[PDB]
Ligand binder design. Structure first.
Ligand SMILES: [Ca+2]
Ligand SMILES: [Ca+2]
Ligand SMILES: [Mg+2]
Length: 293
């Protein structure tokens, strides 16, 4: 009940009024939009069933680490567990969200915004500069540069044998794995699931926050550029890379070309996720993205 949730928040230190609205669009969570007794708006997440324990533990450690090194806001998980996740509403809305009924992409920001490019580049620089020693201390996954390709090769085998893959996607992924010059000889801490729907910004485009941190680890930095090129296009990605390098972002000759292969590999990564988030709904939609059907 609303009273049940009020008790939990009280049982973890937070006093809420009895006025809540519920949202049902989530896969793993139900979402509650609450209000504390002083009038501040809150976001509650209640995982549906058992399963979410290690992700909620990990994401809380990631949030506490990244806020130390970011000049923009991330969710402040004052209550954190599979009983209840609660944080105050952040300052801005995402630059886009997906309409819940149709998945039509509704944009809260001008795509051409110069300020989005410069502030996203600065945020990318800040995320990718987080020291490996600190990532190690928080027990997060660390991919070495020489492990990247065998990892993907394993991913390709597993997704092929169970979900299936179009012949054209398989040949492109193998071409990718064969193209040595595309692969950086270093890895860095990355957000892991970064695109405009996970970036909060003012209407002028200035990044004010970044959300959904549960995938963050040390990996190929191009992963954090793929979501931009998919939505903003090749020319915008080039300007982003230039602003990034201007700030001291560590680049290599083929970062642009590697980012395009990463973006094209989206079907593979989603088929990988769908195999450990078991739904007929997900493997079917992953199947279509891979050129089957
Ligand atoms: Ca900070
Ligand atoms: Ca080769
Ligand atoms: Mg915090």
């Amino acid at each position: 009940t609303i009273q049940d949730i009020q008790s939990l928040a009280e049982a973890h230190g937070l006093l809420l009024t009895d006025k809540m609205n519920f949202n049902e669009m989530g896969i793993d969570f139900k979402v509650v939009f609450a209000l504390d007794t002083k009038g501040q708006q809150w976001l509650l997440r209640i995982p549906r069933r058992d399963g979410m324990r290690e992700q909620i533990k990990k994401e809380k450690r990631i949030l506490e680490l990244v806020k130390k090194h970011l000049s923009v806001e991330v969710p402040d998980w004052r209550i954190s567990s599979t009983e209840l996740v609660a944080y105050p509403i952040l300052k801005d809305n995402p630059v886009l969200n997906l309409d819940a009924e149709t998945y039509e992409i509704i944009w809260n920001m001008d795509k051409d915004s110069p300020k989005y490019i410069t502030s996203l580049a600065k945020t990318l620089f800040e995320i990718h500069s987080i020291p490996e020693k600190e990532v190690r201390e928080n027990d997060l996954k660390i991919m070495k540069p020489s492990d990247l390709r065998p990892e993907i090769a394993n991913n390709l085998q597993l997704v092929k044998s169970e979900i299936g893959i179009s012949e054209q996607l398989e040949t492109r992924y193998r071409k990718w794995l064969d193209n040595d010059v595309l692969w950086a000889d270093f890895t860095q801490f990355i957000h892991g699931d970064l695109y405009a729907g996970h970036v909060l910004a003012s209407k002028d485009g200035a990044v004010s926050g970044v959300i959904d941190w549960s995938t963050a680890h040390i990996d190929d930095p191009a992963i954090d550029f793929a979501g931009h090129v998919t939505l903003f296009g090749e020319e915008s990605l080039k300007t982003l890379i230039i602003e990034y390098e201007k700030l001291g972002g560590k680049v290599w000759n083929k970062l642009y070309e590697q980012t395009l292969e990463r973006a094209a590999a989206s079907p593979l990564m989603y088929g990988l996720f769908a195999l450990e988030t078991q739904n007929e709904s997900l493997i079917v939609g992953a199947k279509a993205q891979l050129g089957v059907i």
